[PDB]
Amino acid sequence: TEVVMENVTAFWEEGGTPVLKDINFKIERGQLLAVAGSTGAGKTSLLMMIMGELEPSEGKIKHSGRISFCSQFSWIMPGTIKENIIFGVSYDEYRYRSVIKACQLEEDISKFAEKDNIVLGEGGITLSGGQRARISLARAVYKDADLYLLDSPFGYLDVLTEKEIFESCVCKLMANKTRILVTSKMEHLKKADKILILHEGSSYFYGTFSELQNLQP
Numbered sequence: 001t002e003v004v005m006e007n008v009t010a011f012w013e014e015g016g017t018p019v020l021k022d023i024n025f026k027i028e029r030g031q032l033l034a035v036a037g038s039t040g041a042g043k044t045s046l047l048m049m050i051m052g053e054l055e056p057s058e059g060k061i062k063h064s065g066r067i068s069f070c071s072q073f074s075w076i077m078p079g080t081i082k083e084n085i086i087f088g089v090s091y092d093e094y095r096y097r098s099v100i101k102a103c104q105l106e107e108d109i110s111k112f113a114e115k116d117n118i119v120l121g122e123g124g125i126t127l128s129g130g131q132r133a134r135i136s137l138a139r140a141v142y143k144d145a146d147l148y149l150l151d152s153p154f155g156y157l158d159v160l161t162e163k164e165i166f167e168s169c170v171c172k173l174m175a176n177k178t179r180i181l182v183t184s185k186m187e188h189l190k191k192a193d194k195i196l197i198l199h200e201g202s203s204y205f206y207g208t209f210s211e212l213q214n215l216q217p
């Protein structure tokens, strides 16, 4: 197993209300877990526990190896689009190009005279929200890691573009990698190896899309 939570309860503030309550899941190496639920359910907090910024008050957590995290808030630092995606990692043309293509950024980049050397975050180009989200996702996916934590990475994208990048990047390009994707979309839950639906900190549902279908619903 690559990631396990067993009976996990946690608090952001000592003596407050628990942000996660008796959470249970297991991800094997190379699987995809979809984490769903309404605002404030605790999805980002769950990711924060995996990254060690929130310790459990009850229960056990297992995870090993380096993590690549994609925030639900897209961000850019001053530098070229290539520098923003590589972001200090060693450069490889094939790897970079595969990520760019999987994130539909090659069409964006091909339109600039400076191509991948277009400068962002310095007052020149002002990117759309969808462009910033895909750059942020590409940055997280380019990093080599054992576990990818993708927190609602499809912000500002229309539903078809989201579907295409979910398939090309999360399912195809990242097929061999252990992935936790915070997402609410039906196809993502259907393609995930496991689904965890959170509601106000608790496990609303945990299992497979097929199991949920068999309950009616």
Ligand SMILES: Nc1nc2c(ncn2[C@H]2C[C@H](O)[C@@H](COP(=O)(O)OP(=O)(O)OP(=O)(O)O)O2)c(=O)[nH]1
Residues within 6 Å of the ligand: 012, 013, 019, 037, 038, 039, 040, 041, 042, 043, 044, 045, 046, 072
């Ligand atoms: N005291 C404190 N509470 C936090 C913090 N971060 C989140 N919370 C609270 C707010 C919520 O009541 C609860 C869950 O917040 P989350 O950000 O984990 O929710 P989630 O990511 O599911 O919501 P989202 O879809 O991103 O709007 O925890 C924090 O850093 N400090």
Ligand SMILES: [Mg+2]
Residues within 6 Å of the ligand: 043, 044, 045, 072, 151
């Ligand atoms: Mg969140």
